[model samples]
Structure formats: C-alpha cells, structure tokens
Target: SMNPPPPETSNPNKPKRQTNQLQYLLRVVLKTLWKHQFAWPFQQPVDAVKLNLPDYYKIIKTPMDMGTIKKRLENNYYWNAQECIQDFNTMFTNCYIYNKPGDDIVLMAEALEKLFLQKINELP
Candidate 1:
C-alpha cells in the first residue's frame, strides 16, 4: 500500500471554518408572494425567478424561465441569498401600500399638481 505524509495542524483563527432561520422564513414569504400570483413586472417577469439568473454584468443570452424566484432555505445551496431577499422585503415594508390595485392612485399621484394647485380660471 502507498503511504502519504502527515498534514498541517489546524488553526482556529486561520479562517478554516465556515458558516440561518431567517432564510427559511424568507423562503416562506417568497413562496407566498409567488403562490398568490402577486409577483412581477410584466417586462421580464418570466425570467426574473429562475434558478440560474443571467449575470447582469454579462450579456444575457437565451432568457431564463421566470416567475417568483423559488427562494427556499431547503434544497438551495445559497440559503443566505434567500435571507437577503427576505431582509430586503422587510426593509421596504414602509415603501407604500401592499401592492393593491387602487393603491397606485395615492402613490402614482404623489407629484400631482392638483393637490396644491389653485384653480386656474375660476371665481375665487
């Protein structure tokens, strides 16, 4: 039998070891957004949620399948990627109303002059 030499000793501070409940919860949140059909902008919604997304830095060829990205703590190697997205959702919690249909009226008209505009030609 062939023998090998001994290996180097381990150093705790040498950065040898490597290391998410939040991810699982985020995945649940993402899945809910997906199942509710409450996801996406029509431009490229289909390719938005693919497993292998195209590199933004690189040219996109053969668009990926899209939908709400199936972010999950389980079965995915990049669990924190899921958590990051979940964290992002929380970060934007106060962005506006919960993506409701008519909610846009309030948000979309934020810059409307009518709110502060005096009647142009009227008896005042």
Candidate 2:
C-alpha cells in the first residue's frame, strides 16, 4: 500500500542550471557519506573499558572512521571513498537489523558495494 512521491517537473527553461544544481546536490550527499564512513572503524575501539554508552550508541547509529574523515576533509582532500564505505556499512547494518528471515547480510553488503562502486565510477 506504500506509494512514492510524485516526480518533480523537469523544467526546461535552464538546462545548465539544472545540471549544476544536481551536481552540487550530489557533492553534498557524497561529502555527508564520507564524513560518516570515516567514522565506522572507530565505533568500537580496543579500549572497551573506557567505552561510554552514548559513544557506543552514536557509533551504532552513525558511520565509523569519522576522525580520519575529518582529518582528510580538514586537509582539503575530495573523494568518494568515505561515502562508499559508509553506504556499504549502512546497507549491511540495515540487512542485519531489518531484513526478513531469509535475508542475509552478505547479500545486502554485496548489493550496496556494487551500487556504491558504480556511483563512484560514474562521478565526474
């Protein structure tokens, strides 16, 4: 019974403007993904005795490896590596958390991996 929203009108008055807008949106999305992706690895550090519930929950909810991402961004590096990692982690977690009885995390991970790879390869 679920239905998606209606598609937006494709305004033809300014094709270049539309293209630029889409590119900008894509960049923002990628940057967000990168920030989260970089935080995944650090979600569960070796120092478990010092682990805080808030920190643990934050890691569980957000992508890991974020510190490295912050460093890269601070150094002005631009790439989709972080986004890819975050997307992959998200897909894996979703599958593990919500997929049906027959659904497997590996399958979801593979699908997400492929999708992220394709998106990165197609990026200009």
Candidate 3:
C-alpha cells in the first residue's frame, strides 16, 4: 500500500495568532488617531461609528500607545507589519476631509501625509 501522505502542516509564512492581536491593536490605534484628530483634517470629534464604515472595516478606538499597540498585537492579535501598513494606507485613503475655517485643512493634509510615510516605514 502507498505510504500515507504527510499530515498537512500550517503554513509557516502565515502570520501567527499575534498578528490578529496586532491587527486589533492597529485598529484601535487608527481609531484613536482619528479620535484625537491626530489624523483628522479638522478639530471635530473622532467618532468612527458616525462615519458609517462598512462592516468589513473593523475600525475601533482604544486608549493605547504605539508600543503597547505593537506589543498587544504581537502577543495576542497576530498582527503583521504588512497588515499594519495596509491598514494605515486604507485609513489615509478613506478618512474624511473637512474644509472648515480654523480647521487647517492644509496642515492636516501635511500631517497625515507625514504620518502615512511613517506608517509605511514601520512595515517590514
């Protein structure tokens, strides 16, 4: 009889469970970035739910720092550098643009552009 095929093995290239945690942490970081207006074009409150994002977008805010976010994801959420980069890219692409007086739209755009650059660099 033919030898039994080797048992299927999990893909080593695939992200570990920590990647999931990292994704979650990134979501929180992104949301916080929005809330704090750190990534917004105006001084308005950052309400992710108010934006009415599609269910597929898991944008949620939490009080956490970059290092904490990274650690949480690496330790539990299984977040990968690629996923973090993708998330930041999507955020910069889809985030709202407010052009109100005293809002500093130009400054906001500049800030966000710099932020995007930094996020891209953070990726592996």
Highest TM-score model number: 3
TM-score, every prediction: 0.26, 0.27, 0.35
Error of 2 at 6 (Å): 26
Candidate 3, residues 7-77: lDDT per residue as tens digits? 22234565465444356345644444545555433323233356543331344222122333334344443
Ranking by TM-score: 3, 2, 1
The model with the greater TM-score, 2 or 3, is 3
| Residue range with the least summed lDDT across 10 consecutive positions in model 2 | 1-10
Give model 3's clash tally.
14
Off by over 4 Å in 3: 1-75, 96-109, 122-124
After superposing candidate 2, which stretches have Cα over 4 Å from the reference?
1-103
Supply every candidate's count of residue pairs whose N, Cα or C atoms clash at under 3 angstroms: 2, 9, 14
> How do the candidates rank by lDDT, highest first?
3, 2, 1
Better of 1 and 2 by TM-score: 2
Off by over 4 Å in 1: 1-23, 40-68, 71-75, 79-82, 86-124
CA lDDT, candidate 3, residue 78: 37
lDDT of 1 at 16: 22
